[PDB]
Amino acid sequence: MVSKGEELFTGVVPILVELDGDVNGHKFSVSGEGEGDATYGKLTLKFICTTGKLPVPWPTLVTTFVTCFARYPDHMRQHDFFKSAMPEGYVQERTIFFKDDGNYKTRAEVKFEGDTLVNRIELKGIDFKEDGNILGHKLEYNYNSHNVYIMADKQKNGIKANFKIRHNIEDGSVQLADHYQQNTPIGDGPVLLPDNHYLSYQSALSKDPNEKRDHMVLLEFVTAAGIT
Secondary structure (H helix, E strand, O other), X not given: OOOHHHHOOXXXXXXXXXXXEEEOOEEEEEEEEEEEEHHHOEXXXXXXXXXXXXXXXXXXXXXXXXXXXXXXXXXXXXXXXXXXXXXXXXXXXXXXXXXOOOEEEEEEEEEEEOOEEXXXXXXXXXXXXXXXXXXXXXXXXOOOOEEEEEEEEHHHOXXXXXXXXXXXXXXXXXXXXXXXXXXXXXXXXXXXXXXXXXXXXXXXXXXXXXXXXXXXEEEEEEEEEOOO
């Protein structure tokens, strides 16, 4: 049997992303469009800064900008919280601590609006150094592969994770971004609370050569792996 959640992701699904941000008082908005194909764990998205020049590096927003598109292998299907919460969706919240710098706090609602999977996000950043790696745009426009360990959060009826993102800097060092995450369902319907498992991410950042606005093109693959 294919679950109600699973069935919404069997083909290619349009994605809309909307982010309102404020970092050290610098307000900005970003809109993204593209498509997800969960069968292949595949996301393609193009993000546009709709208010001017982005005041933080595009790589710092990659994790913020739809884990329902992860590929869960057949043997792992009982651990897919994210699809099980659909179509009503889930709230994803994070704090992201940039080592020796500021932090982001994010809240997103991920849910269907008709046939479109929407990721609506608010982001607030505080305590950034005006000449640190973030406000000083010292990060390379690239992205490393990362594994994220997903744990059930029984009390909140959802999941949680903590993971470290490494953002490469041109002197060979990295800027660490320590993510703490909680997800909880929007509906009061049944969800899958998983056993501990990993999601394996790879992400590629590029540019649309014909786009004059400040923007990012993201290609991301996400696959679950178990602990058996």
